[PDB]
Amino acid sequence: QTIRSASDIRDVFINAGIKGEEYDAAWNSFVVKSLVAQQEKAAADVQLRGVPAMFVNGKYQLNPQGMDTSNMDVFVQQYADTVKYLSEYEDGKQYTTLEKPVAGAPQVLEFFSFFCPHCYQFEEVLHISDNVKKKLPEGVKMTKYHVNFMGGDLGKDLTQAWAVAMALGVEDKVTVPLFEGVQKTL
């Protein structure tokens, strides 16, 4: 169940409960085609240099380097808070303001890769994700986009695979199995 190829990614989806026909149907769908393009554009729109990264309303970029890292606990609590705050802490510290705002951007957008070790931690060690969306205000959702500038050929397939996950609404079912399958390969 390690992920070294496209078919391996398919296997993980199947073992998550998505049937191969549904996966293939979505893999080749218009919506998924459109989602891979938008994942790429949205990264380009904020001039994304790397992951993990998080942006609020196309306006603000979370700045974990300007956060209290005394310990893990305090850091996770402050990160989930800055997200709460901005979705309603001084500029240049816990967050920065984008020069040219991205209109039409999701309320809260995280960028990640199944290849990125700090992304695996953010998601399944620090639980930054779970922790921010447990404090996220009502009517505000967290979106996650996969980036294709990591992992070569396999990275692009994972970006299209994620588009399928979003297309079918099975993000919660495959996130962990996908992180595990790629990180095990490391």
Swiss-Prot record:
Q: Give the source's domain of life in one word.
A: Bacteria
User: Which GO terms label this protein's molecular function in UniProt?
Assistant: protein disulfide isomerase activity; protein-disulfide reductase activity
Cell cycle recorded as keyword: no
Entry keywords, A to Z: Disulfide bond, Periplasm, Redox-active center, Signal
Phenotype upon knockout is: Induction of the PhoP/PhoQ two-component regulatory system, suppressed by 50 uM CuSO(4).
Bridged cysteine pairs (disulfide): C116-C119
Task: Report domain Thioredoxin positions.
Answer: 1-185
Keyword Signal tagged? yes
Concerning Pfam families, the annotation shows: DSBA
Q: What protein family does this chain belong to?
A: Belongs to the thioredoxin family. DsbA subfamily.
Per the entry, what this protein does is: Required for disulfide bond formation in some periplasmic proteins such as PhoA or OmpA. Acts by transferring its disulfide bond to other proteins and is reduced in the process. DsbA is reoxidized by DsbB. Required for pilus biogenesis. PhoP-regulated transcription is redox-sensitive, being activated when the periplasm becomes more reducing (deletion of dsbA/dsbB, treatment with dithiothreitol). MgrB acts between DsbA/DsbB and PhoP/PhoQ in this pathway.
Task: Please state what the protein is called.
Answer: Thiol:disulfide interchange protein DsbA
Q: Which organism is it from?
A: Escherichia coli (strain K12)
Q: Gene name, please? A: dsbA
